[PDB]
Amino acid sequence: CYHGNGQSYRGTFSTTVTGRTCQSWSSMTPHRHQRTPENYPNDGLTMNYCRNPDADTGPWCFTMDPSIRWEYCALTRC
Template sequence: MGKEYRGTINITAMGIQCQQWSVTTPHSHSWNSEPSNYCRNPDNEHYGPWCYTTDPTVRWQYCDVPFCVYSKEAKECKTTTLGYEYYGIANTTITGRECQAWVLDTPHDHSNNELPGNECRNPDASPNGPWCYTTDVSSRWEYCNIPFC
């Protein structure tokens, strides 16, 4: 569904320029937390990233965002400080604690249950990058040590 997409595609699949998320013209909306006009999927649209368009007659359209093919090297690193794009297999925290599976609410209850596996991720734009809930009842969550590419 491309919810994790943080690239810079800003044209719809039909070639229309995307409207800035932070403005409400020509189309009004309430998704104004994104400061760009890049394709995103803030509401889990089944067919992936989309955007409001700058064409007053076309409210929104899907974007043609390709699936990524990672090399082993790229898969195990992040390219930005936030690490939105990180989808590697690291599943231990910076202190060595095992990550709790995202679909579980034990030992720590949370609302990020849609993520698969128990790998380090950054679903909430945490400023220090990927993290996870831990399986240790005394430590709710911790950051993970994900290197830059």
């Protein structure tokens, strides 16, 4: 689980609500993005782990499915 809106989550879960695999935050493939550890160095944007850099309502990630840009992660609110 994550606390509040999930901004402080730093666990190692990396799978979405539909069972897709999170793209790595430093990767531009399949989805080109601007939410990189480059730009957000203090948000825990390590590997492909579920995170919340933009103050969303839960941890999320861009997905490895080329047709689905981003999803919330299959974690529950503590």
